[PDB]
Design a protein around this ligand. Structure first.
Ligand code: NZR
Ligand code: ZN
Ligand code: ZN
Length: 230
Protein backbone atom coordinates (compact mmCIF):
# COMPACT_ATOMS: atom_id res chain seq x y z
CA UNK A 1 0.00 0.00 0.00
CA UNK A 2 3.03 2.38 -0.11
CA UNK A 3 2.16 5.16 -2.57
CA UNK A 4 3.88 5.15 -6.00
CA UNK A 5 4.91 7.91 -8.40
CA UNK A 6 1.83 7.54 -10.68
CA UNK A 7 -0.46 7.72 -7.59
CA UNK A 8 0.65 11.20 -6.38
CA UNK A 9 0.02 14.31 -8.57
CA UNK A 10 2.86 16.86 -8.42
CA UNK A 11 1.89 19.23 -5.61
CA UNK A 12 0.24 16.61 -3.34
CA UNK A 13 1.85 14.92 -0.34
CA UNK A 14 1.02 11.57 1.27
CA UNK A 15 2.04 10.36 4.73
CA UNK A 16 2.67 6.69 5.45
CA UNK A 17 2.84 5.25 8.97
CA UNK A 18 6.09 3.27 9.36
CA UNK A 19 6.03 2.57 13.09
CA UNK A 20 4.58 4.12 16.27
CA UNK A 21 5.56 7.82 16.04
CA UNK A 22 7.36 7.38 12.66
CA UNK A 23 5.99 8.33 9.26
CA UNK A 24 7.44 8.77 5.85
CA UNK A 25 6.28 11.65 3.63
CA UNK A 26 5.96 11.05 -0.10
CA UNK A 27 5.85 13.71 -2.78
CA UNK A 28 6.47 13.94 -6.54
CA UNK A 29 8.32 16.43 -8.60
CA UNK A 30 9.35 17.05 -12.13
CA UNK A 31 13.13 17.24 -12.81
CA UNK A 32 14.70 17.44 -16.30
CA UNK A 33 11.40 16.54 -17.70
CA UNK A 34 10.67 13.32 -15.81
CA UNK A 35 8.55 12.89 -12.63
CA UNK A 36 9.99 11.15 -9.62
CA UNK A 37 8.64 10.23 -6.21
CA UNK A 38 10.66 11.27 -3.13
CA UNK A 39 10.57 10.30 0.54
CA UNK A 40 11.31 12.07 3.78
CA UNK A 41 10.68 11.21 7.42
CA UNK A 42 8.61 12.54 10.32
CA UNK A 43 9.48 11.48 13.85
CA UNK A 44 7.40 12.23 16.94
CA UNK A 45 9.41 14.21 19.57
CA UNK A 46 7.02 14.26 22.58
CA UNK A 47 4.32 16.80 21.67
CA UNK A 48 6.40 18.08 18.68
CA UNK A 49 7.62 16.65 15.39
CA UNK A 50 11.07 16.40 13.86
CA UNK A 51 11.06 16.51 10.05
CA UNK A 52 13.75 14.88 7.92
CA UNK A 53 14.02 16.48 4.46
CA UNK A 54 11.65 18.78 2.61
CA UNK A 55 9.03 17.50 0.14
CA UNK A 56 11.07 18.74 -2.85
CA UNK A 57 10.03 22.31 -3.51
CA UNK A 58 8.10 25.20 -2.04
CA UNK A 59 4.64 24.14 -3.08
CA UNK A 60 5.13 20.54 -2.07
CA UNK A 61 6.60 21.54 1.29
CA UNK A 62 3.63 23.85 2.03
CA UNK A 63 1.39 20.84 1.16
CA UNK A 64 3.48 18.66 3.47
CA UNK A 65 2.87 21.05 6.41
CA UNK A 66 -0.86 21.08 5.63
CA UNK A 67 -0.98 17.22 5.50
CA UNK A 68 0.88 16.95 8.80
CA UNK A 69 -1.55 19.44 10.42
CA UNK A 70 -4.53 17.43 9.19
CA UNK A 71 -3.27 13.88 9.89
CA UNK A 72 -1.05 14.27 12.96
CA UNK A 73 -1.87 17.68 14.45
CA UNK A 74 1.48 18.21 16.25
CA UNK A 75 3.76 21.10 15.24
CA UNK A 76 6.90 20.56 13.28
CA UNK A 77 9.56 22.41 15.28
CA UNK A 78 12.81 21.29 13.65
CA UNK A 79 13.94 19.89 10.32
CA UNK A 80 17.16 18.27 9.17
CA UNK A 81 18.16 18.10 5.47
CA UNK A 82 20.25 15.02 4.63
CA UNK A 83 22.08 16.47 1.63
CA UNK A 84 22.24 19.64 -0.44
CA UNK A 85 20.03 18.74 -3.44
CA UNK A 86 16.58 20.21 -4.01
CA UNK A 87 14.71 17.05 -2.94
CA UNK A 88 16.19 17.67 0.56
CA UNK A 89 16.49 21.47 0.89
CA UNK A 90 13.95 22.76 -1.66
CA UNK A 91 11.25 24.17 0.60
CA UNK A 92 13.55 25.16 3.46
CA UNK A 93 12.38 28.79 3.05
CA UNK A 94 8.75 27.63 3.46
CA UNK A 95 9.71 25.74 6.64
CA UNK A 96 11.72 28.67 8.05
CA UNK A 97 8.73 31.06 7.49
CA UNK A 98 6.39 28.53 9.26
CA UNK A 99 8.54 28.66 12.44
CA UNK A 100 10.51 25.47 11.78
CA UNK A 101 14.17 25.63 12.80
CA UNK A 102 16.16 24.17 9.85
CA UNK A 103 19.45 22.32 10.24
CA UNK A 104 22.10 20.67 8.10
CA UNK A 105 25.77 19.84 8.34
CA UNK A 106 28.26 22.60 7.40
CA UNK A 107 29.18 20.41 4.39
CA UNK A 108 25.56 20.45 3.19
CA UNK A 109 25.21 24.18 3.84
CA UNK A 110 28.39 25.01 1.84
CA UNK A 111 27.29 22.81 -1.07
CA UNK A 112 23.76 24.24 -1.05
CA UNK A 113 25.19 27.77 -1.07
CA UNK A 114 27.55 26.99 -3.98
CA UNK A 115 24.72 25.38 -5.97
CA UNK A 116 22.24 28.23 -5.38
CA UNK A 117 19.89 26.00 -3.37
CA UNK A 118 18.02 26.96 -0.23
CA UNK A 119 20.19 26.94 2.86
CA UNK A 120 19.14 25.52 6.26
CA UNK A 121 19.68 28.05 9.04
CA UNK A 122 21.67 26.06 11.61
CA UNK A 123 24.84 24.05 11.29
CA UNK A 124 25.21 20.48 12.64
CA UNK A 125 28.75 19.98 13.92
CA UNK A 126 30.19 16.56 14.84
CA UNK A 127 29.43 14.89 11.48
CA UNK A 128 32.48 15.72 9.37
CA UNK A 129 34.26 12.38 9.64
CA UNK A 130 32.95 9.08 8.22
CA UNK A 131 31.40 6.99 10.97
CA UNK A 132 30.41 10.08 12.99
CA UNK A 133 27.09 9.98 14.80
CA UNK A 134 25.22 12.63 16.81
CA UNK A 135 21.92 12.61 18.67
CA UNK A 136 19.24 15.01 17.50
CA UNK A 137 16.02 14.68 19.47
CA UNK A 138 14.48 11.25 18.81
CA UNK A 139 17.00 10.25 16.12
CA UNK A 140 20.63 9.57 15.54
CA UNK A 141 22.28 11.30 12.56
CA UNK A 142 25.10 9.31 10.94
CA UNK A 143 27.63 10.39 8.33
CA UNK A 144 28.61 7.19 6.49
CA UNK A 145 31.09 8.78 4.11
CA UNK A 146 30.67 9.90 0.51
CA UNK A 147 28.07 8.04 -1.52
CA UNK A 148 25.30 9.71 -3.54
CA UNK A 149 26.92 12.97 -2.44
CA UNK A 150 29.90 13.88 -0.27
CA UNK A 151 27.59 15.29 2.48
CA UNK A 152 24.87 12.66 2.61
CA UNK A 153 23.59 11.75 6.05
CA UNK A 154 21.48 8.81 7.19
CA UNK A 155 19.02 8.90 10.09
CA UNK A 156 18.20 6.17 12.59
CA UNK A 157 15.18 6.09 14.87
CA UNK A 158 16.39 3.86 17.77
CA UNK A 159 12.93 3.43 19.36
CA UNK A 160 11.58 1.90 16.17
CA UNK A 161 14.70 0.41 14.50
CA UNK A 162 13.97 2.49 11.39
CA UNK A 163 16.83 3.47 9.14
CA UNK A 164 16.18 6.34 6.75
CA UNK A 165 18.90 6.13 4.11
CA UNK A 166 18.03 9.16 2.02
CA UNK A 167 19.55 9.17 -1.45
CA UNK A 168 22.55 7.11 -0.33
CA UNK A 169 20.13 4.12 -0.36
CA UNK A 170 18.17 2.92 -3.39
CA UNK A 171 14.95 0.92 -3.46
CA UNK A 172 14.97 -2.77 -4.46
CA UNK A 173 13.45 -2.21 -7.90
CA UNK A 174 16.23 0.32 -8.80
CA UNK A 175 18.33 -0.53 -11.83
CA UNK A 176 20.51 2.58 -11.82
CA UNK A 177 22.47 4.69 -9.36
CA UNK A 178 20.28 7.69 -10.32
CA UNK A 179 21.76 11.18 -10.59
CA UNK A 180 25.52 10.51 -10.11
CA UNK A 181 26.63 14.06 -10.90
CA UNK A 182 27.81 14.62 -7.30
CA UNK A 183 28.43 10.96 -6.29
CA UNK A 184 31.54 8.98 -5.26
CA UNK A 185 30.91 5.58 -6.90
CA UNK A 186 34.15 4.11 -5.60
CA UNK A 187 33.48 5.01 -1.93
CA UNK A 188 29.74 4.37 -2.01
CA UNK A 189 29.99 0.54 -1.28
CA UNK A 190 32.35 1.31 1.63
CA UNK A 191 29.86 3.89 2.94
CA UNK A 192 27.02 1.32 2.64
CA UNK A 193 29.18 -1.24 4.52
CA UNK A 194 29.67 1.36 7.33
CA UNK A 195 25.85 1.71 7.49
CA UNK A 196 25.39 -2.11 7.54
CA UNK A 197 27.98 -2.41 10.36
CA UNK A 198 26.53 0.48 12.41
CA UNK A 199 22.83 -0.48 12.12
CA UNK A 200 22.59 -4.31 12.11
CA UNK A 201 19.22 -4.23 13.95
CA UNK A 202 17.43 -2.01 11.41
CA UNK A 203 13.99 -3.45 10.72
CA UNK A 204 12.84 -0.95 8.09
CA UNK A 205 15.09 0.77 5.56
CA UNK A 206 13.64 3.78 3.70
CA UNK A 207 15.29 4.92 0.48
CA UNK A 208 15.38 8.53 -0.70
CA UNK A 209 13.11 7.50 -3.62
CA UNK A 210 10.75 4.58 -3.75
CA UNK A 211 9.60 1.73 -1.59
CA UNK A 212 10.84 0.98 1.94
CA UNK A 213 11.99 -2.56 2.69
CA UNK A 214 14.39 -4.29 5.01
CA UNK A 215 18.19 -4.43 5.33
CA UNK A 216 18.49 -5.89 1.78
CA UNK A 217 18.17 -2.33 0.38
CA UNK A 218 21.74 -1.68 1.62
CA UNK A 219 23.35 -4.57 -0.24
CA UNK A 220 21.17 -3.91 -3.27
CA UNK A 221 22.42 -0.31 -3.32
CA UNK A 222 26.07 -1.45 -3.25
CA UNK A 223 25.19 -3.79 -6.18
CA UNK A 224 23.47 -1.03 -8.25
CA UNK A 225 26.48 1.24 -7.73
CA UNK A 226 28.87 -1.48 -8.92
CA UNK A 227 26.72 -2.12 -12.09
CA UNK A 228 26.81 1.64 -12.85
CA UNK A 229 30.67 1.70 -12.39
CA UNK A 230 31.14 -0.77 -15.29
C1 NZR B 1 16.40 5.91 -9.86
C2 NZR B 1 16.48 7.40 -9.61
C3 NZR B 1 16.30 7.91 -8.35
C4 NZR B 1 16.35 9.30 -8.11
C5 NZR B 1 16.64 10.21 -9.10
C6 NZR B 1 16.79 11.65 -8.85
C7 NZR B 1 15.96 12.55 -9.57
C8 NZR B 1 16.05 13.90 -9.45
C9 NZR B 1 16.94 14.43 -8.51
C10 NZR B 1 17.78 13.57 -7.76
S1 NZR B 1 18.98 14.27 -6.68
N1 NZR B 1 18.79 13.91 -5.15
O1 NZR B 1 18.86 15.70 -6.90
O2 NZR B 1 20.24 13.70 -7.15
C11 NZR B 1 17.71 12.19 -7.92
C12 NZR B 1 18.55 11.24 -7.20
N2 NZR B 1 19.37 10.35 -7.80
N3 NZR B 1 19.83 9.58 -6.82
N4 NZR B 1 19.28 9.99 -5.68
N5 NZR B 1 18.50 11.05 -5.88
C13 NZR B 1 16.87 9.68 -10.40
C14 NZR B 1 16.76 8.29 -10.61
ZN1 ZN C 1 20.63 14.08 -4.30
ZN1 ZN D 1 17.48 12.05 -4.39
Amino acid sequence: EYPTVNEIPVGEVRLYQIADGVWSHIATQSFDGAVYPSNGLIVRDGDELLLIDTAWGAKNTAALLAEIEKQIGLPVTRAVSTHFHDDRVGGVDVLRAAGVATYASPSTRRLAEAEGNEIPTHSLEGLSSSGDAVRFGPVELFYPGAAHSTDNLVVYVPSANVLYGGCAVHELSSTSAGNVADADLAEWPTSVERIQKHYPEAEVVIPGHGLPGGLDLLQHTANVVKAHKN
